[PDB]
Design a protein around this ligand. Structure first.
Ligand SMILES: CC(=O)N1C[C@@H](CO)[C@@H]2Oc3c(F)cccc3[C@@H]21
Ligand SMILES: CC(=O)N1C[C@@H](CO)[C@@H]2Oc3c(F)cccc3[C@@H]21
Length: 282
């Protein structure tokens, strides 16, 4: 079926939970043996969210190459994304090592450091220009260059230096700061505006390594971001945009990381975002 009318048909019939459970039943199951090794317990935020072995990002290290991160490669859309958990106190250096090694231009953050009165990820970037951060375990230096605070999101320019080689690179930090502590946003308008700002920066384009996207677990809000982006790109590329099937795209993405889209409300919000977005594109 088309999307907008399939949407109203699920609303009128109140069957979002059944649709979402079908997706959960059909989703791929691949091994994640490296994630479950005992030496990696303090590298995982949640015991039930792990990268598959076949698609995990490897750190360029011989001691321990493990990080909780996955490469999502969308062949028809010609887009790639790295989805990862919010960094932990003992993985902030690994996180920036990955950004460096994978040649990423942008980092997309969809959570606040504290939500619901608990810490959802480490404070992994510097908050003042004159107070830079050094990660001694991976030999990197990170400096805040500029910060632009807007009503729904903040954009930061960061400098990442590989202290071994003295090479430097400019990284863009796109921080969506207004996702509610509970539920999903009422309108997708600010989330779509944010997606378009990431696109306009070059961070999603083939001349760079894959964008790094995270929330707390790296599957819920993070899944919504890449699902909406890929669906909109396919609607622009194809002769028949009504042939884009958001459930089929989500199942393709779940071949590369488990659990993408965590609730039926997140599924409904993803439909809403693609529907409204397709009108603005034209
Ligand atoms: C700020 C600015 O003028 N530029 C030039 C643009 C390419 O010509 C870059 O896009 C961004 C951006 F999205 C955020 C931050 C800085 C930049 C760069
Ligand atoms: C700002 C911008 O470029 N965009 C792209 C649209 C998707 O094509 C987004 O959704 C809306 C919208 F509904 C109203 C207003 C601006 C937007 C966003």
């Amino acid at each position: 079926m088309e999307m907008e009318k399939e949407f109203e048909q699920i609303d009128k019939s109140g069957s979002w939970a059944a649709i979402y459970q079908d997706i959960r039943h059909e989703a791929s199951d691949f091994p994640s043996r490296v994630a479950k090794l005992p030496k990696n317990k303090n590298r995982n935020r949640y015991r039930d969210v792990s990268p598959f072995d076949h698609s995990r990002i490897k750190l360029h290290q011989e001691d321990n190459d493990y990080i909780n991160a996955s490469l999502i490669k969308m062949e028809e859309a010609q887009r790639s994304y790295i989805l990862t958990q919010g960094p932990l106190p003992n993985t902030v250096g690994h996180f920036w090592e990955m950004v460096w090694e994978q040649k990423s231009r942008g980092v997309v953050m969809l959570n606040r450091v504290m939500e619901k009165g608990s810490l959802k990820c480490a404070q992994y970037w510097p908050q003042k220009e004159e107070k830079e951060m050094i990660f001694e375990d991976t030999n990197l230096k990170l400096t805040l260059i500029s910060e632009d605070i807007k009503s729904y999101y903040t954009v930061r320019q960061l400098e990442l230096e590989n202290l071994t080689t003295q090479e430097t690179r400019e990284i863009l930090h796109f921080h969506y700061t207004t996702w509610p502590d509970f539920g999903v946003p009422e309108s997708p308008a600010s989330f779509l505006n944010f997606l378009f700002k990431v696109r306009e920066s070059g961070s999603l384009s083939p001349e760079h390594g894959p964008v790094v996207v995270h929330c707390s677990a790296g599957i819920g809000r993070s899944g919504t971001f890449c699902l909406a982006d890929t669906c909109l790109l396919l609607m622009d590329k194809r002769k028949d945009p009504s042939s884009v099937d958001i459930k089929k795209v989500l199942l393709e993405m779940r071949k590369f990381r488990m659990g993408l889209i965590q609730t039926a409300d997140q599924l409904r919000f993803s439909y809403l975002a693609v529907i409204e977005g397709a009108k603005f594109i034209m």
